[PDB]
Amino acid sequence: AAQTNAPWGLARISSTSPGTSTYYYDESAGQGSCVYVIDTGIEASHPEFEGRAQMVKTYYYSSRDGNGHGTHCAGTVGSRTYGVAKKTQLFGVKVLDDNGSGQYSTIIAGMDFVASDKNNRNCPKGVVASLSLGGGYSSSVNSAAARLQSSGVMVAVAAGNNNADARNYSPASEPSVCTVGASDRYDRRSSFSNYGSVLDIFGPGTSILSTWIGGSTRSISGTSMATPHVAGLAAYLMTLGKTTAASACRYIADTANKGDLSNIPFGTVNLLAYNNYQA
């Protein structure tokens, strides 16, 4: 399949080269997989989600996304125009209030929620969790993400937007999950992107166009917007049978565009997510 005039990030993840604008992907499109978006919620009613997005859990008075960040990430995972996996199922777990903040205990409860809730969903092609969130190092947050990974969920977490080593951030410093940095359209490390040996992969993170609340769209930047590309890519790859939840991050790193990013600090992987689709 070919989506002309796609957001640059979608075109990048199916290209060996920057600077193109068509997204190429197998039409299976993550059908039969599920991605949990653990964030500020999802505006499920957005026409871009086509009835495929639903809120399954909130820890606050409402389950609606009063922020837009969760809606944006969910749109990059699987919206029809801005999504990597245009046929996946999207499950919203609102662990972040409408200011985008959340206590670690609520975040930890949301991760354990997903690790049990996936047994209530039909995800024959596999389960992914996208965590476009993070704070200071927490062994308890790291262990919650490690449990979620261990439960049979692909966990993808933002590396963080501090332009620092991600070892001091959680869940980015949990080694068993898939820690994602951000790159821009010129194949530069995003200036804000964390780095370090804990990173597994880079995805498009600078000026990412996706869904926004109020049924709108907007372009925003962050490792939190590179993570739903990798999360969406994993659901896509799992639906294609090329990998499993336990090995998705390793697989994505094996098949990534190698050594194509600039301003990647020594000791950090130079790997850019790539669906490796041959039309």
Side-chain angles (χ1 to χ4, degrees), residues 80-222:
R80 68 196 179 182
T81 305
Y82 313 101
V84 168
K86 297 171 193 294
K87 298 292 163 181
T88 195
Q89 294 283 126
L90 302 151
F91 301 125
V93 178
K94 180 167 176 66
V95 298
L96 301 181
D97 68 28
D98 292 335
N99 293 283
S101 75
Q103 305 290 333
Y104 303 169
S105 59
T106 296
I107 287 167
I108 285 161
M111 291 184 240
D112 291 329
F113 172 80
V114 174
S116 182
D117 184 66
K118 67 175 202 294
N119 297 312
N120 303 310
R121 308 300 163 184
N122 285 303
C123 314
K125 294 310 154 144
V127 185
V128 183
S130 191
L131 289 60
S132 303
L133 59 83
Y137 180 82
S138 166
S139 47
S140 297
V141 171
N142 282 14
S143 57
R147 289 196 297 282
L148 185 54
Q149 180 68 48
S150 182
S151 78
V153 173
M154 183 177 177
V155 182
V157 311
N161 310 297
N162 314 96
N163 183 32
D165 198 308
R167 44 153 55 100
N168 290 325
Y169 298 93
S170 285
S173 51
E174 178 41 49
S176 63
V177 308
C178 193
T179 301
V180 186
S183 76
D184 72 6
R185 59 163 75 243
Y186 303 110
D187 278 359
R188 304 186 286 234
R189 183 174 61 91
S190 299
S191 69
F192 52 75
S193 180
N194 278 357
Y195 51 80
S197 70
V198 73
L199 276 71
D200 304 294
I201 192 67
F202 283 81
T206 301
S207 298
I208 304 302
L209 175 65
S210 186
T211 48
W212 198 255
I213 50 169
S216 67
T217 54
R218 67 176 60 176
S219 182
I220 58 171
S221 292

Side-chain angles (χ1 to χ4, degrees), residues 225-237:
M225 281 72 74
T227 309
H229 282 92
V230 173
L233 175 52
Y236 167 90
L237 290 173

Side-chain angles (χ1 to χ4, degrees), residues 248-260:
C249 193
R250 179 184 298 211
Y251 179 87
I252 283 151
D254 290 358
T255 55
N257 278 312
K258 310 270 181 283
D260 289 338

